[PDB]
Design a protein around this nucleic acid. Structure first.
Ligand SMILES: [Mg+2]
Ligand SMILES: [Mg+2]
Ligand SMILES: [Mg+2]
Ligand SMILES: [Mg+2]
Ligand SMILES: [Mg+2]
Ligand SMILES: [Mg+2]
Ligand SMILES: [Mg+2]
Ligand SMILES: [Mg+2]
Ligand SMILES: [Mg+2]
Ligand SMILES: [Mg+2]
Ligand SMILES: [Mg+2]
Ligand SMILES: [Mg+2]
Ligand SMILES: [Mg+2]
Ligand SMILES: [Mg+2]
Ligand SMILES: [Mg+2]
Ligand SMILES: [Mg+2]
Ligand SMILES: [Mg+2]
Ligand SMILES: [Mg+2]
Ligand SMILES: [Mg+2]
Ligand SMILES: [Mg+2]
Ligand SMILES: [Mg+2]
Ligand SMILES: [Mg+2]
Ligand SMILES: [Mg+2]
Ligand SMILES: [Mg+2]
Ligand SMILES: [Mg+2]
Ligand SMILES: [Mg+2]
Ligand SMILES: [Mg+2]
Ligand SMILES: [Mg+2]
Ligand SMILES: [Mg+2]
Ligand SMILES: [Mg+2]
Ligand SMILES: [Mg+2]
Ligand SMILES: [Mg+2]
Ligand SMILES: [Mg+2]
Ligand SMILES: [Mg+2]
Ligand SMILES: [Mg+2]
Ligand SMILES: [Mg+2]
Ligand SMILES: [Mg+2]
Ligand SMILES: [Mg+2]
Ligand SMILES: [Mg+2]
Ligand SMILES: [Mg+2]
Ligand SMILES: [Mg+2]
Ligand SMILES: [Mg+2]
Ligand SMILES: [Mg+2]
Ligand SMILES: [Mg+2]
Ligand SMILES: [Mg+2]
Ligand SMILES: [Mg+2]
Ligand SMILES: [Mg+2]
Ligand SMILES: [Mg+2]
Ligand SMILES: [Mg+2]
Ligand SMILES: [Mg+2]
Ligand SMILES: [Mg+2]
Ligand SMILES: [Mg+2]
Ligand SMILES: [Mg+2]
Ligand SMILES: [Mg+2]
Ligand SMILES: [Mg+2]
Ligand SMILES: [Mg+2]
Ligand SMILES: [Mg+2]
Ligand SMILES: [Mg+2]
Ligand SMILES: [Mg+2]
Ligand SMILES: [Mg+2]
Ligand SMILES: [Mg+2]
Ligand SMILES: [Mg+2]
Ligand SMILES: [Mg+2]
Ligand SMILES: [Mg+2]
Ligand SMILES: [Mg+2]
Ligand SMILES: [Mg+2]
Ligand SMILES: [Mg+2]
Ligand SMILES: [Mg+2]
Ligand SMILES: [Mg+2]
Ligand SMILES: [Mg+2]
Ligand SMILES: [Mg+2]
Ligand SMILES: [Mg+2]
Ligand SMILES: [Mg+2]
Ligand SMILES: [Mg+2]
Ligand SMILES: [Mg+2]
Ligand SMILES: [Mg+2]
Ligand SMILES: [Mg+2]
Ligand SMILES: [Mg+2]
Ligand SMILES: [Mg+2]
Ligand SMILES: [Mg+2]
Ligand SMILES: [Mg+2]
Ligand SMILES: [Mg+2]
Ligand SMILES: [Mg+2]
Ligand SMILES: [Mg+2]
Ligand SMILES: [Mg+2]
Ligand SMILES: [Mg+2]
Ligand SMILES: [Mg+2]
Ligand SMILES: [Mg+2]
Ligand SMILES: [Mg+2]
Ligand SMILES: [Mg+2]
Ligand SMILES: [Mg+2]
Ligand SMILES: [Mg+2]
Ligand SMILES: [Mg+2]
Lengths: 203, 51, 148, 99, 193
RNA sequence: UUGACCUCAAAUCAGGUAGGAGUACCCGCUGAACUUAAGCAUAUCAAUAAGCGGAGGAAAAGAAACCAACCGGGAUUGCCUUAGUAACGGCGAGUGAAGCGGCAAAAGCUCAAAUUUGAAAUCUGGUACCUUCGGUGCCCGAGUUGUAAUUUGGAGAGGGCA
RNA sequence: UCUUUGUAAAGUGCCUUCGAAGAGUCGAGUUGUUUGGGAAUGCAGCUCUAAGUGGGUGGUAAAUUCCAUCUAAAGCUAAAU
RNA sequence: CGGACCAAGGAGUCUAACGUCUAUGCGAGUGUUUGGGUGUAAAACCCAUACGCGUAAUGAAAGUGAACGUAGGUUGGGGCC
RNA sequence: UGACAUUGUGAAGAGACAUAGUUUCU
């Protein structure tokens, strides 16, 4: 199947063929609007492993988000407060640029629901993404048992609670001693260990 | 989150109820407790199982 | 309860048990363990020598259990045999048939040797013995057997 | 293996009568396969060598597999991958502009 | 605030801790709702028995391998060894575990013998309709308890072939302590030209 | 000259959806200082308050790129405990989890990557009939730049044999 | 109780061949934040950027030789809370 | 310094974790109350597995681990003979 | 202010395997 080839040719980003491509494509995006409907997956192997399917009710979107750090707003870098908190410039922001991409298109079509998203390109100003979505009211989705979980109400804006792939990452949810602190969910596991369970027959 | 309940050693509990069980003999203390019983057959008053 | 509480006794005396001079203010010494090295150093050398600074190796990620090893002496040992079966074995202190105590079954890790068990043979399944522990068992006809 | 039967020492452990259980295929994850072998190779003559690699083999021909590795270890992430990376350019060279 | 001869206490109350006190007033309440909700399961569960069959398993670490303990499920082996497939044995109240592995035969033979006795003491009503009403036994873990394996005899002969056990320990500890060095001396001695 | 195809537009075009509220609990972003240290900056208060986004009846987590080092264990979650411990710390003030063990509840799985290639086997919509949370015929349309079946690592697939 | 949905669909034994498994990701440098995690617990930014007997973990940095232990970079899911 | 006068409010608490002491239970062990059982239902009644503290110490650790002896000798010791 | 990334295409000149051109800079 032609898909395995695509998967591997994509893993050769310094390869000549790919950067001729990636330099011609990455201009063609910076001309269109920061958010614009894609027409098809430009990485159909990638989409289709990330959950995508070519049938009415699946959507792809290209979104562009500036790179670098979060400059702490704060008028004139003025902090009012202690030295540890006196920084403005070398702070990073806890969610990835994936997330921010997802979140802005998900708001752009609230009637869609963000399935997943993948990285596609980048210059020094922007990182580019294609965000694969699912209209949960399209009946071709609504039947089709496999996807229709997405239709539920608990999967509303799954991408602004970090339940897309990239948000489960930055949320730190993974098993094991590497993730103790953030794993059942950080504030939850926090708040647990900071509760004073008193029994009736006090132990 | 004041205390409200109280732990009693399980055994001290029995020791208590045991002593309370034995006092329900000694005529004097049942009369002491109220209990109009100078007109009862004997103590422990035991009654047919058909009750 | 509150009726034997001294503060009931104190009702009607200006100061509440707390001196007119020195009052009951907020935190005279500082709060908590403040001035440990300073205005409270007399109380921490004596009552708490050894408090300050370091000793020994760290031990990142130390799972207690690795070091699980309850200790029972010859001192008892015989107690790991129910009393009824017990005298059956004291009397008739022989090879051929001598009791087989599985102390790791009984929940110990080492047999130590606190002192004197009778001249009855015992078979001791243990994980670890002390020298004397094993020595004293033999001089009554027992052996240790090494187990896991 | 075979445990000794005591609680310290080399093969410390309770003697049990053992069994060696049916191997798992969540254990042959890395294993090549003729389909991947094919496809990755057809890719390679398709797409070529990459800047940091085109520097790596000429480095080999003119400095060998020590300054090669040392360069590859920084370029990639790690000594280990740097090893198996030199190795991959060694074997570019051989079967190519040679035999 | 340091005074008197007093153990140095460590009371962590410097967060808004009154904001996270959990007083289990609903203890008795919850027992009630738990019992009640079992009883509803037990009824919705038809003549089935609330629980699944668990395997015997020797527990991990140097602290608990003495004991043997009900595990999770039954290994693809024991299931097949006791002659029924996985996918079915889970409809017959038997729990499988595709992760657990069979290294120890004694526990293996055990768990098949566990599988045997379970199948023998249960009856599977047919898919037809009949439903020959047959009164739930409620556990299964009670039906099929888990025993600690007997490892010997109350008394036996005193075999003293002489080697101090104590000493056998240090000697084995040591063999392990210099195993690495003693092998470096074997490499540098083999290197003798 | 006439018909596509790609990509992009327009309709008061056909049907649908999002907004706001609430917010005890829940997924996140963001983020103090009062305070404590008997001073004070690291620390602490607190990954707390205020600010912003997002859900449900619970949320989230979840069938191991886990725990381990055992005779090994076996998704998640919560409690008892581990433990005021290991560890962090002007190693000062102060901070501080986890593995095992018992218990509550249990339940498990599906895509991607495979030629259906002797037949796109699949699907939205329109429409006529019906036994209307839907079914059937016909037609536009989607879809091969891949819709179905099969397969998901515990496996499993193509041959052959019983 | 009415339709037999079927020349349908699934389970099991042996022989043989095969066994496809996620990439600006894993990983590395660094910066900042965070954590009990201490030559660096998680998180993000920027540069570098893998492999297929590979990869990740193994709570002291490194080179070598082994062993154990899972299978990442797509997904769903009741209860106890 | 406060206090014109009256009434009525009005200040050493509760909790977590502790020291000495005392009472009670049981005693080399002890703690039923996470939980299950059960009930005339937030009560009482019952209970299996663990756990906690205690029954071993000492070293930074690797580790080792408590009878020469009527569990010693001496000197005071109540009480008893 | 420097390095890297954004960043490509020529031509002359220096610069190494040590006076073939893959590479690097004026
Ligand atoms: Mg590559
Ligand atoms: Mg379309
Ligand atoms: Mg300020
Ligand atoms: Mg501020
Ligand atoms: Mg740019
Ligand atoms: Mg923490
Ligand atoms: Mg959180
Ligand atoms: Mg949370
Ligand atoms: Mg209670
Ligand atoms: Mg109390
Ligand atoms: Mg009172
Ligand atoms: Mg009074
Ligand atoms: Mg009081
Ligand atoms: Mg007084
Ligand atoms: Mg008075
Ligand atoms: Mg006083
Ligand atoms: Mg005074
Ligand atoms: Mg005064
Ligand atoms: Mg005075
Ligand atoms: Mg002082
Ligand atoms: Mg200290
Ligand atoms: Mg150290
Ligand atoms: Mg150490
Ligand atoms: Mg020790
Ligand atoms: Mg003793
Ligand atoms: Mg000794
Ligand atoms: Mg004093
Ligand atoms: Mg606390
Ligand atoms: Mg405070
Ligand atoms: Mg409540
Ligand atoms: Mg309740
Ligand atoms: Mg149950
Ligand atoms: Mg075992
Ligand atoms: Mg264990
Ligand atoms: Mg029926
Ligand atoms: Mg309209
Ligand atoms: Mg809203
Ligand atoms: Mg909110
Ligand atoms: Mg903050
Ligand atoms: Mg305050
Ligand atoms: Mg201060
Ligand atoms: Mg002050
Ligand atoms: Mg100040
Ligand atoms: Mg500070
Ligand atoms: Mg902090
Ligand atoms: Mg708080
Ligand atoms: Mg808030
Ligand atoms: Mg609602
Ligand atoms: Mg629901
Ligand atoms: Mg519920
Ligand atoms: Mg899996
Ligand atoms: Mg294992
Ligand atoms: Mg688990
Ligand atoms: Mg500590
Ligand atoms: Mg402080
Ligand atoms: Mg503090
Ligand atoms: Mg301290
Ligand atoms: Mg903290
Ligand atoms: Mg804490
Ligand atoms: Mg358990
Ligand atoms: Mg299911
Ligand atoms: Mg099949
Ligand atoms: Mg398929
Ligand atoms: Mg994978
Ligand atoms: Mg750098
Ligand atoms: Mg922050
Ligand atoms: Mg380190
Ligand atoms: Mg860090
Ligand atoms: Mg290493
Ligand atoms: Mg490995
Ligand atoms: Mg899916
Ligand atoms: Mg989920
Ligand atoms: Mg004055
Ligand atoms: Mg006045
Ligand atoms: Mg008054
Ligand atoms: Mg007052
Ligand atoms: Mg007192
Ligand atoms: Mg007493
Ligand atoms: Mg005891
Ligand atoms: Mg009770
Ligand atoms: Mg009730
Ligand atoms: Mg009863
Ligand atoms: Mg039990
Ligand atoms: Mg105990
Ligand atoms: Mg002690
Ligand atoms: Mg000692
Ligand atoms: Mg020393
Ligand atoms: Mg030694
Ligand atoms: Mg001597
Ligand atoms: Mg001597
Ligand atoms: Mg003398
Ligand atoms: Mg410059
Ligand atoms: Mg160009």
């Amino acid at each position: 199947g032609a898909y395995k080839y695509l998967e591997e040719l994509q893993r050769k980003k310094q390869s000549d063929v790919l950067r001729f491509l990636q330099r011609v494509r990455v201009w063609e995006y910076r001309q269109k609007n920061v958010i614009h409907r894609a027409a098809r997956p430009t990485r159909p192997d990638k989409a289709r492993r990330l959950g995508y399917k070519a049938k009415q009710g699946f959507v792809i979107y290209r979104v562009r988000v500036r790179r670098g750090n979060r400059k702490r707003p704060v008028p004139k870098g003025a902090t009012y407060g202690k030295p540890t908190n006196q920084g403005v410039n070398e702070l990073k922001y806890q969610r990835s640029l994936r997330a921010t991409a997802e979140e802005r298109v998900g708001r752009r079509a609230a009637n869609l629901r963000v399935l997943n998203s993948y990285w596609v390109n980048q210059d020094s100003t922007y990182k580019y993404f294609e965000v694969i979505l699912v209209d949960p009211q399209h009946k071709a989705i609504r039947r089709d048992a496999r996807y229709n979980w997405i239709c539920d109400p608990v999967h509303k804006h799954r991408e602004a609670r970090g339940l897309t792939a990239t948000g489960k990452k930055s949320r730190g949810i993974n098993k094991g001693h590497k993730f103790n602190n953030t794993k059942a969910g950080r504030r939850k596991t926090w708040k647990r260990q900071n509760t004073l369970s008193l029994w009736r027959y006090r132990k | 989150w004041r205390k409200w309940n109280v732990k009693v050693n399980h055994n001290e509990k029995r020791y208590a109820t045991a002593s309370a069980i034995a006092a329900t003999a000694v005529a004097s203390l049942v009369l002491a407790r109220g209990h109009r019983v100078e007109k009862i057959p004997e103590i422990p008053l035991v009654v047919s199982t058909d009750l | 309860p509150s009726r034997f509480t001294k503060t009931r006794k104190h009702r009607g005396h200006v100061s509440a048990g707390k001196g007119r001079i020195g009052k009951h203010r907020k935190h005279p010494g500082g709060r908590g363990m403040a001035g440990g090295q300073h205005h409270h150093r007399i109380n921490m050398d004596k009552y708490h020598p050894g408090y300050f600074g370091k000793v020994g190796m760290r031990y990142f990620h130390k799972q207690q259990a690795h070091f699980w090893k309850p200790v029972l002496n010859l001192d008892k040992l015989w107690t790991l045999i129910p009393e009824d079966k017990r005298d059956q074995y004291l009397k008739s202190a022989s090879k051929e048939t001598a009791p087989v105590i599985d102390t790791l079954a009984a929940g110990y890790g080492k047999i130590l040797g606190k002192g004197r068990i009778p001249n009855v043979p015992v078979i001791v399944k243990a994980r670890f013995v002390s020298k004397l522990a094993e020595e004293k068992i033999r001089a009554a006809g027992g052996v240790v057997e090494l187990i896991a | 293996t075979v445990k000794t039967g005591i609680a310290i020492g080399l093969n410390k452990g309770k003697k049990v009568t053992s069994m060696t259980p049916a191997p798992k295929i969540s254990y042959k994850k890395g294993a090549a396969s003729n389909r991947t072998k094919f496809v990755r190779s057809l890719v390679r003559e398709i797409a070529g060598l990459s800047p940091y690699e085109r520097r790596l083999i000429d480095l080999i021909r003119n400095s060998g597999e020590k300054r090669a590795r040392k360069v590859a270890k920084k370029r990639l992430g790690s000594f280990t991958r740097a090893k198996a990376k030199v190795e991959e350019m060694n074997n570019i060279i051989a079967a190519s502009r040679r035999h | 605030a340091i005074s008197k001869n007093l153990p140095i206490l460590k009371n962590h109350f410097r967060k808004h801790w009154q904001e996270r006190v959990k007083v289990h007033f609903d203890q008795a309440g919850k027992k009630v709702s738990r019992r009640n909700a079992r009883a509803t399961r037990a009824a919705k569960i038809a003549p089935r028995p609330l629980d699944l069959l668990r395997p015997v398993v020797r527990a991990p670490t140097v602290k608990y391998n003495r004991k043997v303990r009900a595990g999770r499920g039954f290994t693809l082996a024991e299931v097949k060894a006791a002659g029924l497939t996985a996918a079915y044995a889970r409809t017959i109240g038997i729990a499988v575990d595709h992760r657990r592995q069979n290294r120890n035969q004694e526990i293996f033979d055990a768990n098949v013998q566990r599988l045997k006795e379970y199948q023998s003491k249960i009856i599977v009503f047919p898919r037809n309709g009949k439903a020959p009403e047959a009164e739930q036994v409620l556990s299964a873990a009670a039906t099929f308890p888990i025993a600690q394996p007997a490892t010997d005899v109350e008394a036996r002969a005193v075999q003293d072939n002489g080697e101090s056990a104590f000493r056998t320990l240090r000697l084995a500890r040591s063999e392990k302590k210099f195993r690495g060095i003693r092998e470096k001396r074997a490499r540098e001695k083999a290197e003798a030209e």
